[PDB]
Amino acid sequence: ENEEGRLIEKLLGDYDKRIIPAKTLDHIIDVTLKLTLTNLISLNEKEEALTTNVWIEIQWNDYRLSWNTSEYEGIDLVRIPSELLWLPDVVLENNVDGQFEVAYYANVLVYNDGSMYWLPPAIYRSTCPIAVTYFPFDWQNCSLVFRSQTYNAHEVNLQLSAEEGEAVEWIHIDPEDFTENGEWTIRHRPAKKNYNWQLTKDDTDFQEIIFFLIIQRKPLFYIINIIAPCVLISSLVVLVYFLPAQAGGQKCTLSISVLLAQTIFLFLIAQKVPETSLNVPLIGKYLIFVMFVSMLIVMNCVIVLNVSLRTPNTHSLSEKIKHLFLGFLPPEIKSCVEACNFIAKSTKEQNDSGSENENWVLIGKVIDKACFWIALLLFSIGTLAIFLTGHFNQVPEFPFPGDPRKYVP
Amino acid sequence: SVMEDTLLSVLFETYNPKVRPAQTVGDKVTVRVGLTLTNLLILNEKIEEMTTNVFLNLAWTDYRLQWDPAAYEGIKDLRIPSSDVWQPDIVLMNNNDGSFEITLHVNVLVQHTGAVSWQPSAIYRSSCTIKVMYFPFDWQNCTMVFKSYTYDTSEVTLQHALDAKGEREVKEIVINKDAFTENGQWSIEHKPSRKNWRSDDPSYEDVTFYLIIQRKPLFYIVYTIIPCILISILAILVFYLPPDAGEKMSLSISALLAVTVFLLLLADKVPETSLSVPIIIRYLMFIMILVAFSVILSVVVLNLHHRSPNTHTMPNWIRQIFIETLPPFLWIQRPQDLKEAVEAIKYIAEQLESASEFDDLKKDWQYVAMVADRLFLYVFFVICSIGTFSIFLDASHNVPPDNPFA
Amino acid sequence: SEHETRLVANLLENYNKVIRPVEHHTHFVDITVGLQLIQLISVDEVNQIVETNVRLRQQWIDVRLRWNPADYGGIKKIRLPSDDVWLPDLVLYNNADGDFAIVHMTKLLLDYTGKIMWTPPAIFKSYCEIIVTHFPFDQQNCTMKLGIWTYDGTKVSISPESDRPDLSTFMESGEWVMKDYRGWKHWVYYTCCPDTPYLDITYHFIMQRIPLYFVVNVIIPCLLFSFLTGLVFYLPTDSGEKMTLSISVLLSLTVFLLVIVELIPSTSSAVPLIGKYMLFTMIFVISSIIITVVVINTHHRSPSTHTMPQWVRKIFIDTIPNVMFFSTMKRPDVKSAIEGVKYIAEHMKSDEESSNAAEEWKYVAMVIDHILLCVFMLICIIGTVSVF
Amino acid sequence: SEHETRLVANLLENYNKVIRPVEHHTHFVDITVGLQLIQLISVDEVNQIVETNVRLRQQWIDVRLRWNPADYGGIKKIRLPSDDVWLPDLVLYNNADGDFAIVHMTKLLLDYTGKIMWTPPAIFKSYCEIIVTHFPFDQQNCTMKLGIWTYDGTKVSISPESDRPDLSTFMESGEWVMKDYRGWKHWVYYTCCPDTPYLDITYHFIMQRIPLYFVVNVIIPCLLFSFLTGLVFYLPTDSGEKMTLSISVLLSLTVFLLVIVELIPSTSSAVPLIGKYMLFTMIFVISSIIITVVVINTHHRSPSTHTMPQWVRKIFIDTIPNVMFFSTMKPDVKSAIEGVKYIAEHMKSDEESSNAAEEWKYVAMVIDHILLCVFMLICIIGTVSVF
Amino acid sequence: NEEERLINDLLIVNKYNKHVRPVKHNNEVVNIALSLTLSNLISLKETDETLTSNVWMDHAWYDHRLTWNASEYSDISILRLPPELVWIPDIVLQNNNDGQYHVAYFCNVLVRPNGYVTWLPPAIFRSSCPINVLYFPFDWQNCSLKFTALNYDANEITMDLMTDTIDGKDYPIEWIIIDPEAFTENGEWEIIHKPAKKNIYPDKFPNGTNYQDVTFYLIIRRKPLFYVINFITPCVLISFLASLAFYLPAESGEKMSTAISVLLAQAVFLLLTSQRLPETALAVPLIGKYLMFIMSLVTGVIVNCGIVLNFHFRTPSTHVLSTRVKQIFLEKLPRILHMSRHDEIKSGIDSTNYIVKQIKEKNAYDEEVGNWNLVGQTIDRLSMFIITPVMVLGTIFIFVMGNFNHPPAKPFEGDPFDYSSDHPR
Numbered sequence A: 001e002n003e004e005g006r007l008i009e010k011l012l013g014d015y016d017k018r019i020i021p022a023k024t025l026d027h028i029i030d031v032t033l034k035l036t037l038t039n040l041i042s043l044n045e046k047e048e049a050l051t052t053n054v055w056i057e058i059q060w061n062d063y064r065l066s067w068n069t070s071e072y073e074g075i076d077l078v079r080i081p082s083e084l085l086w087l088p089d090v091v092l093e094n095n096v097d098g099q100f101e102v103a104y105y106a107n108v109l110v111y112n113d114g115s116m117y118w119l120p121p122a123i124y125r126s127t128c129p130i131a132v133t134y135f136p137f138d139w140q141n142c143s144l145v146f147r148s149q150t151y152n153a154h155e156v157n158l159q160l161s162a163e164e165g166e167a168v169e170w171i172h173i174d175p176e177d178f179t180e181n182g183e184w185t186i187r188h189r190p191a192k193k194n195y196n197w198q199l200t201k202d203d204t205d206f207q208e209i210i211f212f213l214i215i216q217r218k219p220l221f222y223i224i225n226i227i228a229p230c231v232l233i234s235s236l237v238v239l240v241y242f243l244p245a246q247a248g249g250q251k252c253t254l255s256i257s258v259l260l261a262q263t264i265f266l267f268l269i270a271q272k273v274p275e276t277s278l279n280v281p282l283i284g285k286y287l288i289f290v291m292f293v294s295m296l297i298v299m300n301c302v303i304v305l306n307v308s309l310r311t312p313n314t315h316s317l318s319e320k321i322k323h324l325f326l327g328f329l330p331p332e333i334k335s336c337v338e339a340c341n342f343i344a345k346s347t348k349e350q351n352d353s354g355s356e357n358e359n360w361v362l363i364g365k366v367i368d369k370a371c372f373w374i375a376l377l378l379f380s381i382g383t384l385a386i387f388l389t390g391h392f393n394q395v396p397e398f399p400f401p402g403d404p405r406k407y408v409p
Numbered sequence B: 001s002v003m004e005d006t007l008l009s010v011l012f013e014t015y016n017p018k019v020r021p022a023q024t025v026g027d028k029v030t031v032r033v034g035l036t037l038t039n040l041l042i043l044n045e046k047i048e049e050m051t052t053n054v055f056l057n058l059a060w061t062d063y064r065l066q067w068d069p070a071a072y073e074g075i076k077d078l079r080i081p082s083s084d085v086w087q088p089d090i091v092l093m094n095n096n097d098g099s100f101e102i103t104l105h106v107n108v109l110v111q112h113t114g115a116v117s118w119q120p121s122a123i124y125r126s127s128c129t130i131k132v133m134y135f136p137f138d139w140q141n142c143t144m145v146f147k148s149y150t151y152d153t154s155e156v157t158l159q160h161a162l163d164a165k166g167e168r169e170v171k172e173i174v175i176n177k178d179a180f181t182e183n184g185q186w187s188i189e190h191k192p193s194r195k196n197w198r199s200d201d202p203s204y205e206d207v208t209f210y211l212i213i214q215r216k217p218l219f220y221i222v223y224t225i226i227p228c229i230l231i232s233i234l235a236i237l238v239f240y241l242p243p244d245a246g247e248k249m250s251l252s253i254s255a256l257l258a259v260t261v262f263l264l265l266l267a268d269k270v271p272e273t274s275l276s277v278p279i280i281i282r283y284l285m286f287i288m289i290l291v292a293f294s295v296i297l298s299v300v301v302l303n304l305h306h307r308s309p310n311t312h313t314m315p316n317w318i319r320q321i322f323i324e325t326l327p328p329f330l331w332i333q334r335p336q337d338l339k340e341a342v343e344a345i346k347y348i349a350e351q352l353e354s355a356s357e358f359d360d361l362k363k364d365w366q367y368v369a370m371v372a373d374r375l376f377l378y379v380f381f382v383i384c385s386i387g388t389f390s391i392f393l394d395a396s397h398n399v400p401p402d403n404p405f406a
Numbered sequence C: 001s002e003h004e005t006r007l008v009a010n011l012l013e014n015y016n017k018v019i020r021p022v023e024h025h026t027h028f029v030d031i032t033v034g035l036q037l038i039q040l041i042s043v044d045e046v047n048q049i050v051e052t053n054v055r056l057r058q059q060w061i062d063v064r065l066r067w068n069p070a071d072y073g074g075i076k077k078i079r080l081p082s083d084d085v086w087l088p089d090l091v092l093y094n095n096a097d098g099d100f101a102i103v104h105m106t107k108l109l110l111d112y113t114g115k116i117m118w119t120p121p122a123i124f125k126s127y128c129e130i131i132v133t134h135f136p137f138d139q140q141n142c143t144m145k146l147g148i149w150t151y152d153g154t155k156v157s158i159s160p161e162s163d164r165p166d167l168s169t170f171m172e173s174g175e176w177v178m179k180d181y182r183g184w185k186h187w188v189y190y191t192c193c194p195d196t197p198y199l200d201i202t203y204h205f206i207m208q209r210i211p212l213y214f215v216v217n218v219i220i221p222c223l224l225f226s227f228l229t230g231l232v233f234y235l236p237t238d239s240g241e242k243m244t245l246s247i248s249v250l251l252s253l254t255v256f257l258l259v260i261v262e263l264i265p266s267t268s269s270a271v272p273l274i275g276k277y278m279l280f281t282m283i284f285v286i287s288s289i290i291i292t293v294v295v296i297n298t299h300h301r302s303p304s305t306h307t308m309p310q311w312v313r314k315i316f317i318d319t320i321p322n323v324m325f326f327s328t329m330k331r332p333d334v335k336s337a338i339e340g341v342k343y344i345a346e347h348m349k350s351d352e353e354s355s356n357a358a359e360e361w362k363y364v365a366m367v368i369d370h371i372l373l374c375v376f377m378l379i380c381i382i383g384t385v386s387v388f
Numbered sequence D: 001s002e003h004e005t006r007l008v009a010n011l012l013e014n015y016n017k018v019i020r021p022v023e024h025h026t027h028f029v030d031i032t033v034g035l036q037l038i039q040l041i042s043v044d045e046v047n048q049i050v051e052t053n054v055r056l057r058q059q060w061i062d063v064r065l066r067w068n069p070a071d072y073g074g075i076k077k078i079r080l081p082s083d084d085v086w087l088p089d090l091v092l093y094n095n096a097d098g099d100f101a102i103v104h105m106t107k108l109l110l111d112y113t114g115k116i117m118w119t120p121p122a123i124f125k126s127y128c129e130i131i132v133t134h135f136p137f138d139q140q141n142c143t144m145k146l147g148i149w150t151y152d153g154t155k156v157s158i159s160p161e162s163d164r165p166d167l168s169t170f171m172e173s174g175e176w177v178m179k180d181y182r183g184w185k186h187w188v189y190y191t192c193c194p195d196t197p198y199l200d201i202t203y204h205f206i207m208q209r210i211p212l213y214f215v216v217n218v219i220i221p222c223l224l225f226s227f228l229t230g231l232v233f234y235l236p237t238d239s240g241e242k243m244t245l246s247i248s249v250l251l252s253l254t255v256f257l258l259v260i261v262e263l264i265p266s267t268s269s270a271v272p273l274i275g276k277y278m279l280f281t282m283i284f285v286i287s288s289i290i291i292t293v294v295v296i297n298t299h300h301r302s303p304s305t306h307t308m309p310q311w312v313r314k315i316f317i318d319t320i321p322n323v324m325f326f327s328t329m330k331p332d333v334k335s336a337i338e339g340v341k342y343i344a345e346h347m348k349s350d351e352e353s354s355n356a357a358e359e360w361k362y363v364a365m366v367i368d369h370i371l372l373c374v375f376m377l378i379c380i381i382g383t384v385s386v387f
Numbered sequence E: 001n002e003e004e005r006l007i008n009d010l011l012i013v014n015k016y017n018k019h020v021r022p023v024k025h026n027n028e029v030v031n032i033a034l035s036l037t038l039s040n041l042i043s044l045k046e047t048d049e050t051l052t053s054n055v056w057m058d059h060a061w062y063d064h065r066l067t068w069n070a071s072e073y074s075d076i077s078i079l080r081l082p083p084e085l086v087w088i089p090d091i092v093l094q095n096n097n098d099g100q101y102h103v104a105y106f107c108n109v110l111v112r113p114n115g116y117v118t119w120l121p122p123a124i125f126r127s128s129c130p131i132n133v134l135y136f137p138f139d140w141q142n143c144s145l146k147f148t149a150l151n152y153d154a155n156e157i158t159m160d161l162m163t164d165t166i167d168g169k170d171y172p173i174e175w176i177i178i179d180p181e182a183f184t185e186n187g188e189w190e191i192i193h194k195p196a197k198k199n200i201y202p203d204k205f206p207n208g209t210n211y212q213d214v215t216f217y218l219i220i221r222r223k224p225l226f227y228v229i230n231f232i233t234p235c236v237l238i239s240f241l242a243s244l245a246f247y248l249p250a251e252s253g254e255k256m257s258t259a260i261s262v263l264l265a266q267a268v269f270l271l272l273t274s275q276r277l278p279e280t281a282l283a284v285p286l287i288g289k290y291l292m293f294i295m296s297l298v299t300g301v302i303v304n305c306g307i308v309l310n311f312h313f314r315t316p317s318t319h320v321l322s323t324r325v326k327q328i329f330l331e332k333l334p335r336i337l338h339m340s341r342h343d344e345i346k347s348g349i350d351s352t353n354y355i356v357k358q359i360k361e362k363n364a365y366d367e368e369v370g371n372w373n374l375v376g377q378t379i380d381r382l383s384m385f386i387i388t389p390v391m392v393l394g395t396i397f398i399f400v401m402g403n404f405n406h407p408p409a410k411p412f413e414g415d416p417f418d419y420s421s422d423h424p425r
């Protein structure tokens, strides 16, 4: 028969799962962790949660489950269900939902030395405070914090995995099992053991194993699908300075329509970023700037229309203003005779009034051109500056700026 | 009671609920399956799923749970928790989520003759394929397939539940009118039940309960069809406005954008299958294409109205059609100083001659535009009325068959 | 059944479910694994997750569960609950949102020779490498990677039932078409442990999207507004409605871009063709708005301040209008009274000359519009003939 | 450890977790309850539900779980699964969507003197009355009511560990600020049961919303669109665009009001100041549209059918224009003879009609300049008051 | 601790079987007194037609196997036992939307020395409440929590209503118990009537599990301030702008823009109202009816403004002004509506005569155009005086008829009892 039968019966007989396998009082179990990332499933910005598919490798040394191989026909390795063994309650402390433990309770590999090797897979949803100051060019700094839910530093000593005699200080990524997210590219993946010095060696929160994921958003999709249409639409405000300043020119129509388009784009952006209030996203700042510029241009269109459509009846054309805006910036015979004279006089007055209207139109055109040259420059400078400072947001060269180490295999 | 406890101890001394009760090897277990629909909760068209609150009336015979009532002070029947007795693994095979088994585990009722009865309540998400040809004037045909997940036709025989009197088999879903909640959006036309086999799989037999349910389309009518009718009315009207008004594009484009928004928002409530296009979406596309053609023809009319002899010369065929033939059919018929003074008067007279001639030709162009506009008005009114009436008459004549075919 | 009760009592009296079913520890359990796709629940492109309803048929041999039928009344098959016997921990490697292993422990058939067949159901939410580059006419290939988790190839061996997953009882989705499907067994050797291979079975399905819904609901309105884009060139400038038409077309296209971006994932591996073409149509609408603003400015140009350059007159009045064949273009007190009449004549002279210059400017603007309209019509004709 | 497993076997050999941990049934178990807020997951204003991640620290004394360290190799502390021993049934009274009791049954520390320490985590989805009067500059005050469900004050007594919850490990929300937090203990004597006090501990948190998301995404565009209301008056009627601008501003404002409505709970307890201000803005915009239509109708008043009343001429032409300063306003020849006289008289009549029309246009101009001055005064006083 | 000895005697020595009803004889029946305490009304999703309520769903019954003599032990007058150790009746909410039938938390049961068992578990119940959208947003809903006993039939257990004593006589509790202080009044809904009734169905046999039930009704009225302020007022004002659009002149070129913009705003409001209600076809909501009527009226306004514009821009060269229309719209209607009010010499002479003739024809043309303008003014003034009174009367009638909608002040129309906490029967 399968010789593992009597071996497992002997091992699991007289074995209390609820007892830590401390050989003596001062013995501390050296629990060893190692994370393997198979897929960065998603990063929910609105909920601020990173969803990952990771195998967690936990190694320890339970002295109770050891045997002499020659006694069991050279059996040097068995599999025991994890629900039957003592386990270090290594849990993800910073989960967003209530999921602390692992998804699937895989078997534990037991070696005759007593070495315990547990490799359960898990879907982890871990909180990741998102810095939106440079969206959509941002890079996020997401972290996974593992700690023993039950035991403290006087019973369990969390350590990072030591491979080939050198400590594994990174989230191991197996090229055979890895599908790059496509939206987020992983730049740095360091790992380190951390201490909360506010607490003593007790309190269960003294020691942690933190795995960091410095991920960078690929901006091409956001650039093409949001930023480029927004810039193209916001570049239309400067066109209102070439439409005629009269009925049917439709300066105000174009200006207000571009304002409404920018409002719609602001609403669209509001759906793509978290509702945190620590900073304004870069695209949000650009949208606020262009909406303010378009409002100023609406005011300018109203002013230009009011200037151009003035008449001598309502307003008087001062000579100072005219010089400023046109000199520096740019029986029956008697009745018939009386009737003819009146006709000539009326025609002369009408022509003079038309000329005054034309002068007002010319002043309006001059103001219009000067304001166009101001507004085009303002819009171009704002757009170029904002998206240049967006493009110049690099991921730090080192995983920790204080440290000089790369944390790569 | 003491005697009930003694009887329970006697019955379950060696009873193993993991063993199908067969007195002789090869005997089958007759299982009667019936459905009671307390409430048809939801028909989610988006995910093609039907959520229902049901009682799954099951009944079989267990020769092991047999006793003499006279030996236990006349205990006719018992209520035993469903975890203690063997039950067939009757599950809903076509569920949408992973819920196969029954939500609520009520006690079974064991008669002294071994007849076990079970009435477990459940909330089932059954997957239902949706025919979107006539949405929202449509009737759906949603099935609920029940069968034993483990035991095949060689171990359990599925039958139909007997009525309350226990005389005849009930071949339909039982609706208890005293404890039933009308859905309010659907009406249950037919509710037959029928056994189904498979030709290629003799070990397959299941009981399917069909729900032929007709949608009540008042909500979709009120909130989508009438506003689009008003939009189409505006799209017809745009051809009655005079080109001088300067609001033809405003009206036509506003109608186009409104109907596009209606289409976009109604795209949320329709399923995303590509087997057919719902009649409401076809109507919306018809209205949208018609309004786009209205915009194009309004642009053509505006172009015709604003021409001038200094810019265009009227072709002979346009004059032959729009000036002479159509208007009858559309009922839309219509000393040095003295020398200089005389020269000035003569020049003014010639200027007035030229102005009158130019104005007359411009009037001819504007009349061409007006006649074409009136023709467009009549044609578009006829087309819109015919199309809307045809589409909604086709939709209105869609009812579930009188024979449920099940 | 009495005989079945006795048989079940005897089978599990000293049966340990922690022990592999092998006569000797060096052997391996040969497991036959087959997938049966009952239904394709969904393909979530934004989250890149494929939800499928499957049956995971597993067959193997358990020597410890054998009996002689003649001793138990002739019973040859029983249904034991799966929680009582050894089961293979078969895990979906590329799970994305669901459960890794089987969670619905149904009963399993067990013959008298030890043969065990187990058919548990499952909802697999696998991870799908969605490639939106021909959306909505795309073809998606994404897999279901299964394997024994805690056993290598020297302890538990899995082999597919058949070269293809069983789709006999497949429920047609109505949105996707099962073009192809295959199941491949993989041997993976790691540098750590070359002696022990790791076995794997990858089932892949090629889904072809049925595009009618997306066509009708997105593409046709977008095509309609793209066609209406070039209609502004036929609108006369005097009407003062070109801005309304052009800007409304732009707003409709920005709304439809909003619709597109919420339909496809935010991945940057490949730019969708629909989004790229929508961006191209937006660029066209912006160019049309700019050039029609130029046209409006030219049309309303004041003849007093602006005088027509000779080259403009030659190009747009002397040569281009002849090119268009399909166009209909044209190619005491008495002395005071006398002086007043003369002044009226002079003012009419000046008005006629200014109106002639303004008419020339309007003619140039009309020629520009007609050039652009001809270009747009040529583009439309070429596109319609080429693609359809 | 063989000593530890022997000790655990000895402790729970005859331990009945149903019974209360008291030497005599008339005593009461004193339980020290402390709350440790780890994170504030969310505050759903619409459903009025606050979801928080907490650790519910509890301490008490179980006399049955005492042992002598000298007999077990000097063991002082052990860890036992929480399900093996008696536990208090603490219930969050104001639970809204989550679970009433603790469901994560984590291990508990057991001391050699019988002192039990238990710190199970939890996700409290507690009901939170939301006051939206000062949205988005509001502060919320809601609570977590904890208490022993099936035991009165004479059988199980809970007391707070400290006057405040332990926010030492609190994760900064980025949307709310912990202005204050406090825990109180309440005695309740119901009319049924005067002899038995009912105890409950209420932990309340004062949360201050950080107003930057809504200032950027709601208030700023609303101000930008409301400021355009004043441009309708400065726009001359001849442009034929007053209605376009005014109607567009009104539609944008109503859309923004609808969004603001969607961002607040549907409760009618109080009307938000932001919503009330938006309603007043819409009312003023509609009044502006009414006066704009009146101005447009006045500007086009034909002299043929309308004669300017003296009460209009006296006030709008001779009273206001002198008051407002900053503006810059104010055979066959017989047929020829008869026709020339007719032309002269027609031009005289045309001049008179044009003069009346110009008077009407002047009246419209003074009216909408008065309205513009009113708008500028409102703007200045409002920006000074807010500042 | 004597409690350990007592519980060991009750549940171990006596062989307590938690799967057997607490009756000396099989034919005997167990009375399950019930009551409900509404601690908080979580919500009512109209779109989901779900009533989410936080309740404490009390039970009280008798268990002859859980009796003891307090004198023999210490004077233990009450005992706490986990529910999974003693028989408990499985009262289930039959009309729940989700799969949660039982109580969420299985708290302990109190046992008196005389066998009286009490059990007060809290529960979050998502019951199914059909929604009457006829008078939205002034509507009042009538939800119900229907509790049935499915594990047993009426021949084995009898559901009841808890009895309370005030002056030596027991009155059944026919209402949901609401603590005046612990209960936080919901912002959107207020409870008008909360009756509790025990229904028996005579058309079914006692052997069935559907022969009886206990239903706690909950008539709740919506507070309409929120929707009135935020949805009805903007709609009414924007609608009135449509009728005001009749006052714009034809030369303005903004009549159609104003009317169309009002129509689009009304359409958006209708769509948003649609989003907020269940897709039921029993009736069109009051706000829905008002929106439909106002959109139809604004469409009429748009059409009639189009007619006015068509009338204004007619000219003698395309249309003829007949005497009938002239006298109708220029004589009668304006009064009714009170509307306001040598060779060179010959060549020169011929040229002057021609100039005079052309100016006279121009004057006649302009006179006809002015007459058409006056006709348009008459038409749209008549349109205003016809439509705006209809608009205001329709708005007032709809929003007053809806306001005159109250709960009937007595649940169970045919029952004179008030079902109130202050006057038990």
Ligand SMILES: *[C@@H]1O[C@H](CO)[C@@H](O[C@@H]2O[C@H](CO)[C@@H](O)[C@H](O)[C@H]2NC(C)=O)[C@H](O)[C@H]1NC(C)=O
Pocket: E142, E144, E197, E199, E217, E219, E408, E410, E411, E412, E413, E414
């Ligand atoms: C609230 O609803 C319940 C049931 O949905 C109503 O109770 C029924 O009322 C009708 C109306 O007369 C009676 O004919 C039935 O006999 C009642 N059924 C029961 C079981 O009592 C109740 O009347 C409704 N309340 C109000 C105020 O309308």
